[PDB]
Amino acid sequence: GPWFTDGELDIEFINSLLTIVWRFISENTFPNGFKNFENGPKKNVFYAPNVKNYSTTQEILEFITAAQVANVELTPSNIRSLCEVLVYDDKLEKVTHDCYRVTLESILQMNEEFSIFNYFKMFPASKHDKEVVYFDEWTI
Amino acid sequence: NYMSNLPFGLGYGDVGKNHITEFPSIPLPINGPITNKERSLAVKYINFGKTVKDGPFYTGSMTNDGIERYSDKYLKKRKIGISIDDHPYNLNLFPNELYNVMGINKKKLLAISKFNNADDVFT
Amino acid sequence: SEKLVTPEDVMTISSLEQRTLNPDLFLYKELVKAHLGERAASVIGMLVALGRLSVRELVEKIDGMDVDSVKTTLVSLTQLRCVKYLQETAISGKKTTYYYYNEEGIHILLYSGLIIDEIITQMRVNDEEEHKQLVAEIVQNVISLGSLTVEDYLSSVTSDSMKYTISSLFVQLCEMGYLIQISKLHYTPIEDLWQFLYEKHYKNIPRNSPLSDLKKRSQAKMNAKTDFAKIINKPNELSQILTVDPKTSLRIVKPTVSLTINLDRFMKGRRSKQLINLAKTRVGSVTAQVYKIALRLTEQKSPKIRDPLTQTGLLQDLEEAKSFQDEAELVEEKTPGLTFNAIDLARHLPAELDLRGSLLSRKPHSASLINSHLKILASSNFPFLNETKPGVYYVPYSKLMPVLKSSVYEYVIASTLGPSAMRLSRCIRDNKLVSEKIINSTALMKEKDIRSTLASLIRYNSVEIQEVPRTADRSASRAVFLFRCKETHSYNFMRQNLEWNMANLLFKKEKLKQENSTLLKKANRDDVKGRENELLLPSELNQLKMVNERELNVFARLSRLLSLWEVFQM
């Protein structure tokens, strides 16, 4: 499809498309777009569980076509594939066919008790320690 | 000829070097520094270990001379250790053949108690 | 490599001698050698290595122990709930006592300070002046001595007020179900108990039955099952505060029986904590407090982490497996204590939940606001809450624990191998079975990185490679390869990997404390403890602080490893 350039799939243009569609889904699902998730998580406000806050594939078609950042007109099947890529990488979530909302783990991945879920925060240990834990140690 | 069929993604230079690293190079997200609550938790672990290692259930590791000197007078071992039979024992829980070493007749006395609000770390 | 290493360097610096031992054996032996002595370590090592053993077999196998040393070691292990026993009689009438190993005592040795911290957190006593120290010390004394009677512990203190507080605090600890009465049930194996109950209920049936053998077997099995369900949950319900009003119209724990730590309720608490940590990812921060309150209200009546009927060897019958699953869904849905509404959760929110402008419906702990929080919990992707009737909620432990397993495993593999690992794992878990080209079309990223990341995933069993031959005799030279995800192999492999890492940490800690015994022994005894400054030399201060800092890091990392290992037991 349009993803291939010179007979090979690229990653920069695909990442730009994923960034813009994830930004749009952030704008629609969580309130005020990204503007509420700024600062600490204490002040964030979420929508009531009775709203139609997700964006379908036609909405992505309209938004990207208006933006024209993809330089070839794209198909709804491409939108479904891109949203499948995002829901693979735990960027959004599906409840119904062609229905997606942005998650909150991805927002925290941008910018306390231990949880594996927030691995982006805590730092690797200072070197030259003999009691360092390696996940690779047992196998090889 | 044998070493003439390389796959599509290799050249003549990559092969010929069989040094698989024995040391690891991939860390986990658990490796970071120590926080205050984790410090208290580590204090609790080390205090429990130090308590049990001296407790009535340890078992061995599998001067000190018998000559008659006079430094032994008014001199006595700094502690009296606790044996296997110096603790309360519930008779029903233990099996039957184990009644030999443990003391049914001997008085059940010891019940220790210890906890500290001050950290046992010198740092 | 700046300079090539000889195999001597590999043996000395890199942990290679430790990669040839089972994670279970290595973990249990290092734990027992760390807390108890070497004799208990060797006895537990042979018990795990050779399975069931008798006292004569233990004398014959272990070198360097007589019968008296072995019996002293077994008494020490049996007090700490670390070895199970069973008295078996043969045809000749010679009764012999076989010994086993049980998980519970070892896990208690591995969960000590975490148990203390959790019971401090679950005390929930307002304005405590001396009560926290007292709860900490009674819990430490209970865990260290294995089991103790309340009367024997009371005799060590003579003052009246502290003894009254002992009575009140033990009543409090037994009320939620952390300290339970022990009996011979906790020392017999589950399999042997089920075998005995089944055989007694099968032999008891009247003979000469004109009724079928298979359904007679199933009938005896059902009677044994209901008696099993009666006997396992017997100490769990209430067995130690049944006495009311000995003197002066008060409730006191029974001054006749010994109490012991209840590990399975602590596992319930840790699973609740894991669910809270998962809920802190998709929705809410105050909503996380709401779901925490919802779990903590229903933490005591929660089902087991592992059904004892599952360990009884009765999984070969598929019908019994389906019956176990359906019974789990039965109990988790309509337990007479796990159902709650908004009003029940109203009386438990502390004075920190604001909820004035917590939600915006547009595109004072009230019932409507807490109902909206419970609804936004009910609309999440993972089944955090489910509705048997609109208004009343139940948490589906049967259909959330696999979800928590999958999420934790995916985040671990992502943080240790990169986001490409997450992408490939989720792509081959969503699709049931793919070739390479379906991956290259659906997962929009470059070819060689797919091949590299997927090749790296095979080494840790994230994907299983399925061959499809195109030749009369099977060969990989001309065949097509599909890629699947088998959750069971992967979960088991990473569970054993985390056990190995835990045991490696504890072995390194034990080696560090053994190699530096002189300074630690000099600073150990009480007259210098806390005032090490005056007698020690400048180098000794640095050495002691280095040892203590390394010890604290080791045990903190051990706690962090437990936080990932507890999930894979469920």
Short mmCIF file of N, CA, C and O in Angstrom, two decimals, chain A residues 3-4 8-11 14-15 18 30-31 41 44-52 81-82 84-85 87-90 93-95 101 103-105 108-109 113-117 119 122 125 128-140, chain C residues 15 19 23 277-278 281-285 357-363 372 375-376 381 404 408 411-412 415-417 419 422-423 426-427 430-431 440 442-447 459-460 493-494 496-497 500-501 505 508 512 550 554 557 560 564:
data_model
loop_
_atom_site.label_atom_id
_atom_site.label_comp_id
_atom_site.label_asym_id
_atom_site.label_seq_id
_atom_site.Cartn_x
_atom_site.Cartn_y
_atom_site.Cartn_z
N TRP A 3 2.16 2.59 2.48
CA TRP A 3 3.23 2.49 3.47
C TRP A 3 4.58 2.23 2.82
O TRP A 3 5.60 2.77 3.25
N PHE A 4 4.60 1.39 1.78
CA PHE A 4 5.86 1.06 1.12
C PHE A 4 6.41 2.26 0.37
O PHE A 4 5.68 3.00 -0.30
N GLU A 8 9.91 -0.91 -0.06
CA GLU A 8 10.24 -1.31 1.30
C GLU A 8 9.48 -0.43 2.28
O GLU A 8 9.31 0.77 2.06
N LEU A 9 9.00 -1.05 3.35
CA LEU A 9 8.27 -0.33 4.38
C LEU A 9 9.21 0.57 5.18
O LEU A 9 10.27 0.14 5.62
N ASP A 10 8.80 1.82 5.36
CA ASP A 10 9.54 2.79 6.16
C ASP A 10 8.93 2.90 7.55
O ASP A 10 7.85 2.38 7.82
N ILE A 11 9.65 3.59 8.44
CA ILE A 11 9.22 3.64 9.83
C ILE A 11 8.97 5.08 10.27
O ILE A 11 8.18 5.33 11.18
N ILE A 14 5.41 6.18 8.92
CA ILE A 14 4.43 5.41 9.69
C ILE A 14 4.33 5.94 11.11
O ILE A 14 3.24 6.07 11.67
N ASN A 15 5.48 6.26 11.72
CA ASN A 15 5.47 6.82 13.06
C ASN A 15 4.79 8.19 13.10
O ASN A 15 4.10 8.50 14.07
N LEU A 18 1.10 7.47 13.00
CA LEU A 18 0.64 6.96 14.28
C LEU A 18 0.59 8.07 15.32
O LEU A 18 -0.35 8.12 16.13
N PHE A 30 -10.07 11.55 25.87
CA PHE A 30 -9.93 12.27 27.13
C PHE A 30 -10.28 13.74 26.93
O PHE A 30 -10.08 14.29 25.84
N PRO A 31 -10.82 14.40 27.96
CA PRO A 31 -11.27 15.78 27.81
C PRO A 31 -10.12 16.73 27.52
O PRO A 31 -8.98 16.49 27.93
N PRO A 41 -1.05 14.19 38.03
CA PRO A 41 -2.31 13.46 37.82
C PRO A 41 -3.40 13.81 38.82
O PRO A 41 -4.52 13.30 38.71
N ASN A 44 -6.51 15.94 37.16
CA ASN A 44 -7.19 15.49 35.95
C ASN A 44 -8.66 15.16 36.21
O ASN A 44 -9.04 14.76 37.32
N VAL A 45 -9.49 15.39 35.20
CA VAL A 45 -10.93 15.15 35.28
C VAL A 45 -11.32 14.33 34.06
O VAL A 45 -10.98 14.70 32.93
N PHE A 46 -12.02 13.22 34.28
CA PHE A 46 -12.41 12.33 33.20
C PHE A 46 -13.92 12.38 32.98
O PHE A 46 -14.70 12.68 33.88
N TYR A 47 -14.31 12.07 31.75
CA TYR A 47 -15.70 12.11 31.34
C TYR A 47 -16.51 11.02 32.04
O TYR A 47 -15.98 9.98 32.44
N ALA A 48 -17.80 11.27 32.19
CA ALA A 48 -18.71 10.31 32.77
C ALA A 48 -18.88 9.11 31.85
O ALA A 48 -18.81 9.24 30.63
N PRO A 49 -19.12 7.90 32.41
CA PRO A 49 -19.26 6.68 31.60
C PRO A 49 -20.61 6.54 30.91
O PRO A 49 -21.22 5.47 30.90
N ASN A 50 -21.08 7.63 30.31
CA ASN A 50 -22.32 7.62 29.53
C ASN A 50 -22.20 8.46 28.26
O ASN A 50 -23.22 8.88 27.71
N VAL A 51 -20.98 8.71 27.79
CA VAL A 51 -20.73 9.62 26.69
C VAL A 51 -20.21 8.83 25.49
O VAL A 51 -19.68 7.72 25.63
N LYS A 52 -20.38 9.42 24.30
CA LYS A 52 -19.92 8.82 23.05
C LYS A 52 -18.59 9.49 22.69
O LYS A 52 -18.50 10.33 21.80
N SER A 81 -6.09 -0.82 9.89
CA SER A 81 -4.77 -1.41 10.11
C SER A 81 -3.92 -0.56 11.05
O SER A 81 -3.22 -1.10 11.92
N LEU A 82 -3.96 0.76 10.89
CA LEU A 82 -3.18 1.64 11.76
C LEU A 82 -3.67 1.57 13.20
O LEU A 82 -2.87 1.54 14.15
N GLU A 84 -5.17 -0.98 14.50
CA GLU A 84 -4.72 -2.29 14.98
C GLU A 84 -3.27 -2.24 15.43
O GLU A 84 -2.90 -2.87 16.42
N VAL A 85 -2.42 -1.50 14.70
CA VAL A 85 -1.03 -1.33 15.12
C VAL A 85 -0.97 -0.63 16.47
O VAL A 85 -0.20 -1.02 17.36
N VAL A 87 -3.35 -0.46 18.84
CA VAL A 87 -3.88 -1.30 19.91
C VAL A 87 -2.95 -2.47 20.18
O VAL A 87 -2.98 -3.06 21.27
N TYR A 88 -2.10 -2.83 19.22
CA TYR A 88 -1.04 -3.79 19.50
C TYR A 88 -0.04 -3.22 20.49
O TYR A 88 0.29 -3.85 21.50
N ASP A 89 0.43 -2.00 20.24
CA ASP A 89 1.47 -1.39 21.06
C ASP A 89 0.93 -0.80 22.36
O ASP A 89 1.66 -0.06 23.03
N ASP A 90 -0.31 -1.13 22.73
CA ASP A 90 -0.98 -0.61 23.92
C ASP A 90 -1.01 0.91 23.89
O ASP A 90 -0.62 1.60 24.83
N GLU A 93 -7.44 1.32 22.61
CA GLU A 93 -8.22 0.16 23.01
C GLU A 93 -9.51 0.10 22.21
O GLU A 93 -10.14 1.12 21.94
N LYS A 94 -9.90 -1.12 21.86
CA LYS A 94 -11.09 -1.41 21.07
C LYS A 94 -12.16 -2.05 21.94
O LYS A 94 -11.88 -2.97 22.71
N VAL A 95 -13.40 -1.57 21.81
CA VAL A 95 -14.56 -2.22 22.38
C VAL A 95 -15.52 -2.74 21.31
O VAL A 95 -16.18 -3.76 21.51
N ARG A 101 -10.51 4.02 21.64
CA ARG A 101 -10.26 5.14 22.53
C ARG A 101 -8.81 5.10 23.00
O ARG A 101 -8.21 4.03 23.11
N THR A 103 -5.76 5.15 25.61
CA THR A 103 -5.57 4.66 26.96
C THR A 103 -4.87 5.72 27.80
O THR A 103 -4.67 6.86 27.37
N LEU A 104 -4.48 5.36 29.02
CA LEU A 104 -3.79 6.28 29.91
C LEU A 104 -2.35 5.87 30.19
O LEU A 104 -1.56 6.72 30.61
N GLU A 105 -1.99 4.61 29.94
CA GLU A 105 -0.60 4.20 30.10
C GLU A 105 0.31 4.91 29.10
O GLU A 105 1.44 5.29 29.43
N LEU A 108 1.07 8.47 30.37
CA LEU A 108 2.10 8.48 31.40
C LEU A 108 3.47 8.12 30.83
O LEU A 108 4.49 8.54 31.38
N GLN A 109 3.51 7.35 29.73
CA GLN A 109 4.78 7.05 29.09
C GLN A 109 5.44 8.28 28.49
O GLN A 109 6.65 8.24 28.20
N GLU A 113 4.91 3.63 45.22
CA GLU A 113 5.03 2.18 45.29
C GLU A 113 5.48 1.62 43.95
O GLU A 113 5.17 2.19 42.89
N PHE A 114 6.21 0.51 43.99
CA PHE A 114 6.67 -0.10 42.75
C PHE A 114 5.49 -0.70 42.01
O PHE A 114 4.66 -1.41 42.59
N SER A 115 5.41 -0.42 40.72
CA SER A 115 4.54 -1.16 39.82
C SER A 115 5.31 -1.40 38.53
O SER A 115 6.07 -0.53 38.09
N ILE A 116 5.12 -2.58 37.94
CA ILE A 116 5.77 -2.89 36.67
C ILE A 116 5.22 -2.00 35.57
O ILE A 116 5.86 -1.80 34.53
N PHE A 117 4.03 -1.45 35.79
CA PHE A 117 3.30 -0.75 34.75
C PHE A 117 3.99 0.55 34.37
O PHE A 117 3.97 0.95 33.19
N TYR A 119 7.39 1.51 34.06
CA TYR A 119 8.81 1.20 33.97
C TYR A 119 9.63 2.34 33.39
O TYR A 119 10.87 2.29 33.45
N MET A 122 11.69 4.74 36.86
CA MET A 122 12.83 4.40 37.70
C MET A 122 14.03 3.99 36.86
O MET A 122 13.91 3.31 35.83
N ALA A 125 20.59 1.09 37.70
CA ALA A 125 21.48 1.30 38.83
C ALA A 125 22.85 1.78 38.37
O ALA A 125 23.25 1.58 37.22
N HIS A 128 29.22 -0.97 38.44
CA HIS A 128 30.16 -1.58 39.40
C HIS A 128 29.45 -1.95 40.70
O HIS A 128 29.86 -1.58 41.80
N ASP A 129 28.36 -2.71 40.55
CA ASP A 129 27.67 -3.34 41.66
C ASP A 129 27.54 -4.83 41.36
O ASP A 129 27.14 -5.21 40.26
N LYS A 130 27.89 -5.66 42.34
CA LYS A 130 27.90 -7.10 42.16
C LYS A 130 26.56 -7.75 42.49
O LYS A 130 26.43 -8.97 42.39
N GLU A 131 25.56 -6.95 42.88
CA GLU A 131 24.24 -7.46 43.23
C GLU A 131 23.20 -6.82 42.32
O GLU A 131 22.16 -6.33 42.77
N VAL A 132 23.50 -6.82 41.03
CA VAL A 132 22.64 -6.29 39.98
C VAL A 132 21.86 -7.46 39.38
O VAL A 132 22.40 -8.56 39.23
N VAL A 133 20.59 -7.23 39.08
CA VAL A 133 19.71 -8.28 38.59
C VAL A 133 19.59 -8.17 37.08
O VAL A 133 19.27 -7.10 36.55
N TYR A 134 19.85 -9.27 36.39
CA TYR A 134 19.71 -9.35 34.95
C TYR A 134 18.66 -10.39 34.59
O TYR A 134 18.71 -11.52 35.07
N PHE A 135 17.70 -9.99 33.75
CA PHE A 135 16.70 -10.91 33.23
C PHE A 135 17.32 -11.96 32.30
O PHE A 135 16.75 -13.04 32.14
N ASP A 136 18.48 -11.66 31.73
CA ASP A 136 19.15 -12.52 30.77
C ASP A 136 20.05 -13.56 31.43
O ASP A 136 20.60 -14.42 30.73
N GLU A 137 20.18 -13.53 32.75
CA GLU A 137 21.20 -14.32 33.43
C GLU A 137 20.94 -15.82 33.36
O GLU A 137 21.86 -16.60 33.12
N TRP A 138 19.69 -16.24 33.56
CA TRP A 138 19.41 -17.67 33.70
C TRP A 138 19.58 -18.41 32.38
O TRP A 138 20.18 -19.49 32.34
N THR A 139 19.05 -17.85 31.30
CA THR A 139 19.07 -18.57 30.02
C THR A 139 20.48 -18.67 29.46
O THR A 139 20.94 -19.76 29.12
N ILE A 140 21.18 -17.54 29.36
CA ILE A 140 22.52 -17.53 28.79
C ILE A 140 23.47 -16.75 29.68
O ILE A 140 24.55 -16.35 29.25
N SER C 15 28.17 -15.65 37.27
CA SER C 15 27.44 -16.71 37.94
C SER C 15 27.09 -17.82 36.96
O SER C 15 26.02 -17.80 36.35
N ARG C 19 23.81 -21.68 37.39
CA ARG C 19 22.83 -21.88 36.33
C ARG C 19 22.48 -23.34 36.10
O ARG C 19 21.67 -23.64 35.22
N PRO C 23 15.53 -23.81 39.87
CA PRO C 23 15.16 -22.62 40.65
C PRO C 23 14.45 -22.94 41.95
O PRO C 23 14.67 -22.25 42.95
N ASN C 277 -2.80 -1.95 41.53
CA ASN C 277 -1.73 -1.44 40.69
C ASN C 277 -2.10 -1.49 39.22
O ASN C 277 -1.72 -0.61 38.44
N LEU C 278 -2.84 -2.52 38.81
CA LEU C 278 -3.34 -2.57 37.43
C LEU C 278 -4.38 -1.48 37.18
O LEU C 278 -4.38 -0.85 36.12
N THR C 281 -3.63 2.19 36.02
CA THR C 281 -3.05 2.36 34.70
C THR C 281 -4.05 2.80 33.65
O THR C 281 -3.75 3.68 32.85
N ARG C 282 -5.24 2.19 33.61
CA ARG C 282 -6.23 2.56 32.61
C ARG C 282 -7.04 3.78 33.02
O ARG C 282 -7.15 4.75 32.26
N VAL C 283 -7.64 3.75 34.21
CA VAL C 283 -8.60 4.78 34.60
C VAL C 283 -8.24 5.32 35.98
O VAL C 283 -7.92 4.55 36.90
N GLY C 284 -8.25 6.64 36.11
CA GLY C 284 -8.41 7.30 37.39
C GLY C 284 -7.18 7.30 38.28
O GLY C 284 -6.24 6.52 38.12
N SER C 285 -7.20 8.23 39.23
CA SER C 285 -6.33 8.21 40.40
C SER C 285 -7.13 8.18 41.69
O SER C 285 -6.85 7.36 42.57
N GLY C 357 -15.80 18.14 41.58
CA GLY C 357 -15.70 18.28 40.14
C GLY C 357 -14.88 17.16 39.54
O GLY C 357 -14.09 17.38 38.62
N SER C 358 -15.06 15.95 40.08
CA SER C 358 -14.24 14.82 39.66
C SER C 358 -14.56 14.38 38.23
O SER C 358 -13.68 13.87 37.54
N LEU C 359 -15.80 14.55 37.79
CA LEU C 359 -16.20 14.14 36.46
C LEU C 359 -16.97 15.26 35.78
O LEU C 359 -17.57 16.12 36.43
N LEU C 360 -16.96 15.24 34.45
CA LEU C 360 -17.73 16.16 33.62
C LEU C 360 -18.63 15.32 32.72
O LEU C 360 -18.16 14.66 31.79
N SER C 361 -19.94 15.34 33.00
CA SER C 361 -20.88 14.55 32.22
C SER C 361 -21.03 15.11 30.81
O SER C 361 -21.34 14.37 29.87
N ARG C 362 -20.83 16.41 30.65
CA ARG C 362 -20.92 17.04 29.34
C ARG C 362 -19.81 16.54 28.43
O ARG C 362 -18.69 16.27 28.89
N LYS C 363 -20.12 16.39 27.15
CA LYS C 363 -19.14 15.93 26.16
C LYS C 363 -18.02 16.96 26.03
O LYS C 363 -18.28 18.16 25.98
N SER C 372 -21.27 6.64 39.82
CA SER C 372 -20.60 6.98 38.57
C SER C 372 -19.19 6.40 38.52
O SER C 372 -18.73 5.94 37.47
N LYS C 375 -19.50 2.81 37.81
CA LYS C 375 -19.88 2.58 36.42
C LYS C 375 -18.68 2.75 35.48
O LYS C 375 -18.51 1.96 34.55
N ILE C 376 -17.85 3.77 35.72
CA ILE C 376 -16.66 3.94 34.87
C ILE C 376 -15.67 2.81 35.11
O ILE C 376 -14.89 2.46 34.22
N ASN C 381 -11.94 -1.76 29.80
CA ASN C 381 -11.68 -2.89 28.90
C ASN C 381 -11.51 -4.19 29.67
O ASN C 381 -12.14 -5.20 29.34
N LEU C 404 -4.71 -9.99 34.22
CA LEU C 404 -3.59 -9.41 34.96
C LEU C 404 -2.28 -10.11 34.61
O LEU C 404 -1.24 -9.46 34.46
N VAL C 408 0.84 -8.07 32.92
CA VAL C 408 2.13 -8.02 33.61
C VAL C 408 3.22 -8.63 32.74
O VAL C 408 4.33 -8.09 32.64
N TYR C 411 4.11 -6.23 29.86
CA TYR C 411 4.92 -5.09 30.29
C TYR C 411 6.33 -5.50 30.68
O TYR C 411 7.28 -4.76 30.41
N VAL C 412 6.50 -6.68 31.29
CA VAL C 412 7.84 -7.14 31.62
C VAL C 412 8.66 -7.36 30.36
O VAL C 412 9.80 -6.90 30.24
N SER C 415 9.63 -4.08 28.83
CA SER C 415 10.67 -3.32 29.51
C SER C 415 12.02 -4.01 29.44
O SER C 415 13.05 -3.35 29.65
N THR C 416 12.06 -5.31 29.17
CA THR C 416 13.36 -5.98 29.10
C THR C 416 13.84 -6.25 27.68
O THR C 416 15.04 -6.40 27.48
N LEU C 417 12.95 -6.29 26.68
CA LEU C 417 13.39 -6.48 25.30
C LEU C 417 13.02 -5.34 24.37
O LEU C 417 13.47 -5.35 23.22
N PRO C 419 10.00 -2.08 23.03
CA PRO C 419 8.62 -2.01 22.53
C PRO C 419 8.34 -2.91 21.34
O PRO C 419 7.18 -3.27 21.10
N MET C 422 6.82 -5.99 22.80
CA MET C 422 5.39 -5.80 23.05
C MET C 422 4.59 -5.90 21.76
O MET C 422 3.55 -6.57 21.73
N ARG C 423 5.06 -5.25 20.70
CA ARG C 423 4.30 -5.22 19.46
C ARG C 423 4.13 -6.61 18.88
O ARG C 423 3.02 -7.02 18.53
N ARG C 426 1.87 -8.89 21.24
CA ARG C 426 0.45 -8.60 21.14
C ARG C 426 -0.09 -8.97 19.76
O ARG C 426 -1.25 -9.40 19.65
N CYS C 427 0.72 -8.82 18.71
CA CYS C 427 0.26 -9.18 17.37
C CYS C 427 0.04 -10.68 17.24
O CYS C 427 -0.91 -11.12 16.59
N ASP C 430 -3.12 -11.63 19.64
CA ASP C 430 -4.43 -11.30 19.09
C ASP C 430 -4.80 -12.29 17.98
O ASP C 430 -5.80 -13.01 18.08
N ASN C 431 -4.01 -12.33 16.92
CA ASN C 431 -4.14 -13.38 15.93
C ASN C 431 -3.73 -14.71 16.55
O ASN C 431 -2.73 -14.78 17.27
N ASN C 440 4.29 -9.02 8.76
CA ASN C 440 4.89 -7.91 8.03
C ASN C 440 3.84 -6.99 7.42
O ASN C 440 4.09 -5.80 7.22
N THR C 442 0.53 -6.69 8.79
CA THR C 442 -0.32 -6.12 9.84
C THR C 442 0.47 -5.22 10.79
O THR C 442 0.03 -4.12 11.11
N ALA C 443 1.63 -5.67 11.25
CA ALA C 443 2.47 -4.87 12.14
C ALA C 443 3.38 -4.00 11.27
O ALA C 443 4.36 -4.48 10.71
N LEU C 444 3.05 -2.72 11.18
CA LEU C 444 3.71 -1.80 10.25
C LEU C 444 5.07 -1.39 10.80
O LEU C 444 5.20 -0.36 11.47
N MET C 445 6.09 -2.19 10.50
CA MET C 445 7.48 -1.88 10.81
C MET C 445 8.37 -2.80 9.98
O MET C 445 7.91 -3.77 9.37
N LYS C 446 9.67 -2.50 9.98
CA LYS C 446 10.58 -3.03 8.98
C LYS C 446 10.83 -4.53 9.16
O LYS C 446 10.68 -5.08 10.25
N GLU C 447 11.21 -5.17 8.06
CA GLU C 447 11.29 -6.63 7.98
C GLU C 447 12.36 -7.19 8.90
O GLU C 447 12.10 -8.10 9.71
N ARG C 459 14.03 -17.38 22.39
CA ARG C 459 14.94 -17.82 23.43
C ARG C 459 14.29 -17.84 24.81
O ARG C 459 14.70 -18.62 25.67
N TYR C 460 13.29 -16.99 25.04
CA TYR C 460 12.61 -16.93 26.33
C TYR C 460 11.18 -17.46 26.24
O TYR C 460 10.39 -17.22 27.15
N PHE C 493 7.87 -20.42 32.36
CA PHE C 493 9.29 -20.13 32.17
C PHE C 493 9.70 -18.86 32.89
O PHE C 493 10.74 -18.83 33.56
N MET C 494 8.89 -17.80 32.77
CA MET C 494 9.27 -16.57 33.45
C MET C 494 9.09 -16.69 34.96
O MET C 494 9.83 -16.05 35.72
N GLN C 496 9.81 -19.43 36.72
CA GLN C 496 11.04 -20.07 37.18
C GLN C 496 12.24 -19.13 37.04
O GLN C 496 13.16 -19.18 37.86
N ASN C 497 12.24 -18.27 36.01
CA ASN C 497 13.31 -17.29 35.87
C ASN C 497 13.34 -16.32 37.04
O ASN C 497 14.41 -16.00 37.57
N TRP C 500 14.70 -18.06 40.07
CA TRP C 500 16.15 -18.17 39.99
C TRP C 500 16.82 -16.85 40.35
O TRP C 500 17.83 -16.84 41.05
N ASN C 501 16.29 -15.73 39.85
CA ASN C 501 16.89 -14.44 40.16
C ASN C 501 16.80 -14.13 41.64
O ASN C 501 17.76 -13.61 42.24
N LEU C 505 20.05 -13.61 44.11
CA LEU C 505 20.21 -12.46 45.00
C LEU C 505 20.50 -12.91 46.42
O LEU C 505 21.42 -12.40 47.07
N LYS C 508 24.03 -14.37 46.78
CA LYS C 508 25.06 -13.34 46.81
C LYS C 508 25.07 -12.62 48.16
O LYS C 508 26.14 -12.31 48.70
N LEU C 512 28.20 -12.54 50.78
CA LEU C 512 28.74 -11.29 51.29
C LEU C 512 28.80 -11.29 52.81
O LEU C 512 29.80 -10.87 53.40
N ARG C 550 24.70 -2.49 50.68
CA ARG C 550 24.49 -3.61 49.76
C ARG C 550 23.38 -4.53 50.25
O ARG C 550 22.57 -5.00 49.44
N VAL C 554 19.95 -5.39 48.24
CA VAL C 554 19.59 -6.78 47.92
C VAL C 554 18.17 -7.07 48.35
O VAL C 554 17.37 -7.62 47.58
N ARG C 557 15.54 -5.20 46.22
CA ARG C 557 15.34 -5.86 44.94
C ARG C 557 14.60 -7.18 45.10
O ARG C 557 13.85 -7.58 44.20
N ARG C 560 11.04 -6.25 45.22
CA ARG C 560 10.57 -5.88 43.88
C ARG C 560 10.41 -7.11 42.99
O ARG C 560 9.56 -7.12 42.10
N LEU C 564 6.62 -9.10 41.24
CA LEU C 564 6.35 -9.66 39.93
C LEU C 564 6.15 -11.16 39.95
O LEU C 564 5.53 -11.71 39.03
#
